[PDB]
Amino acid sequence: TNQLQYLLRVVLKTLWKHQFAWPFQQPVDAVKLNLPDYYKIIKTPMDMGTIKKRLENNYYWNAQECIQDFNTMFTNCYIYNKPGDDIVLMAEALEKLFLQKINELPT
Amino acid sequence: NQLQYLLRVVLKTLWKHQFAWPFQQPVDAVKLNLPDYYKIIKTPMDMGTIKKRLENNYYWNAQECIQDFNTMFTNCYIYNKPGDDIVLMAEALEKLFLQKINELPTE
Amino acid sequence: TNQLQYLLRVVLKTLWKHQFAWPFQQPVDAVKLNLPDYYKIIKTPMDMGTIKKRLENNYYWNAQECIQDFNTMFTNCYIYNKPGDDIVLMAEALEKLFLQKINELPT
Numbered sequence: 001t002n003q004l005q006y007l008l009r010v011v012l013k014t015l016w017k018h019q020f021a022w023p024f025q026q027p028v029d030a031v032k033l034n035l036p037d038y039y040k041i042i043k044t045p046m047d048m049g050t051i052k053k054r055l056e057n058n059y060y061w062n063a064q065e066c067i068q069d070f071n072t073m074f075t076n077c078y079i080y081n082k083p084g085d086d087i088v089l090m091a092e093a094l095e096k097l098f099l100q101k102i103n104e105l106p107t
Numbered sequence: 108n109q110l111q112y113l114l115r116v117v118l119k120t121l122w123k124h125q126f127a128w129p130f131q132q133p134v135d136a137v138k139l140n141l142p143d144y145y146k147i148i149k150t151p152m153d154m155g156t157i158k159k160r161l162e163n164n165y166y167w168n169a170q171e172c173i174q175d176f177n178t179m180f181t182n183c184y185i186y187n188k189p190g191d192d193i194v195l196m197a198e199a200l201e202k203l204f205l206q207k208i209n210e211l212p213t214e
Numbered sequence: 215t216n217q218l219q220y221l222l223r224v225v226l227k228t229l230w231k232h233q234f235a236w237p238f239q240q241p242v243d244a245v246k247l248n249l250p251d252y253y254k255i256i257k258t259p260m261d262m263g264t265i266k267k268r269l270e271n272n273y274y275w276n277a278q279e280c281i282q283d284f285n286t287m288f289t290n291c292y293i294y295n296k297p298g299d300d301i302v303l304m305a306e307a308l309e310k311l312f313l314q315k316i317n318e319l320p321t
């Protein structure tokens with residue numbers, strides 16, 4: 001099986017279905033929340049919404065580039081928020097699940 | 108790629124046909140007052156969805172796409188009486204599907 | 215690498231950034247601009263928008279089909295408009311650039 005297929009049909013599907021996915025399914029809406037510093041501090045934004053489109057529209061060079069985007073999504077969240085926030089536990093849980101599913105990856 | 112063939116040849120052929128229109132998007136059970144449709148048919152399918160899936164790198168391979176076309180025809184034959192307009196249209200389209208699927212490459 | 219991937223991430227990216235891209239990012243709206251003859255003279259219309267959808271959705275059989283589309287876009291423009299017209303000077307700059315990027319295509 002292709003790596004990128006797996007990332008779409010398996011890795012991403014699992015994370016998307018998951019309970020805590022909703023804040024990561026579209027980008028952080030800085031106006032709606034009142035956080036003018038978000039686009040200042042977070043240099044390269046990223047969300048599963050974006051990732052899903054990239055898989056569906058032939059953007060990624062290799063599976064290593066799609067994984068990059070996942071880590072950036074997580075690392076972004078951890079930078080901008082203080083540990084033990086609500087959002088951060090959510091991210092942490094998703095990254096747990098994410099990292100499980102990478103290890104099953106085709107080879 | 109056989110998937111290319113299913114998009115560019117098989118699906119265009121079927122979509123362009125006169126009988127396609129009821130199979131180009133889901134059956135809208137609300138509009139038809141068919142509240143039993145979504146309870147009887149458990150995997151609904153249509154060319155709208157199939158098209159989307161080919162355009163968005165969903166399928167594991169050509170043979171999963173063929174499964175979807177079959178599910179489309181057989182859902183029709185499950186829900187509807189034989190000899191109904193809808194069922195004769197489905198049969199027309201399936202005949203034409205089987206012709207086009209024969210000249211499939213082997214990759 | 216796959217050449218289609220190159221056409222998406224490098225060629226089309228570069229052309230779409232460019233200052234003169236905007237009139238070529240969607241079909242030439244003959245009704246808006248008030249050109250009844252455009253669609254009689256131009257038998258195969260084309261634009262960077264349609265090429266993009268096509269790259270994003272697995273439409274192209276191979277990379278030479280995509281390259282023809284880019285060439286149709288320019289020639290259509292030279293056919294329909296007069297020399298010295300602005301749109302032609304724009305397309306000419308875009309074509310220049312297109313041809314540079316095409317000379318670093320994977321093989």
Ligand SMILES: Cc1cc(F)cc(C)c1Oc1ccc(C(C)(C)O)cc1-c1cn(C)c(=O)cc1NCC(=O)N1CCOCC1
Binds near residue numbers: 077
């Ligand atoms: C504000 C908030 C309250 C809450 F109880 C739970 C969450 C996840 C939450 O965070 C979000 C809620 C909605 C949205 C929308 C739909 C606008 O994209 C985003 C977030 C949010 C998402 N992500 C990925 C973040 O990194 C941060 C988000 N919220 C800003 C935030 O965490 N805070 C606002 C002020 O700083 C402390 C808490």
Ligand SMILES: Cc1cc(F)cc(C)c1Oc1ccc(C(C)(C)O)cc1-c1cn(C)c(=O)cc1NCC(=O)N1CCOCC1
Binds near residue numbers: 132134135191
């Ligand atoms: C209702 C109907 C009348 C007709 F003269 C021809 C058709 C094809 C027809 O079927 C449909 C018409 C519209 C739509 C829309 C566009 C709303 O999705 C769907 C169908 C239809 C499509 N498919 C694939 C089906 O299996 C069944 C559909 N309609 C309900 C239907 O045919 N019946 C409902 C119960 O009575 C027996 C027949």
Ligand SMILES: Cc1cc(F)cc(C)c1Oc1ccc(C(C)(C)O)cc1-c1cn(C)c(=O)cc1NCC(=O)N1CCOCC1
Binds near residue numbers: 237242294
């Ligand atoms: C009309 C016009 C005036 C102008 F000052 C600069 C341009 C590029 C221009 O051309 C277009 C402007 C907008 C649009 C929109 C965005 C609506 O589709 C299209 C064009 C246009 C684009 N392309 C690719 C063409 O080949 C021709 C276009 N316009 C009609 C046109 O250029 N002419 C109309 C008849 O007179 C000679 C010039």
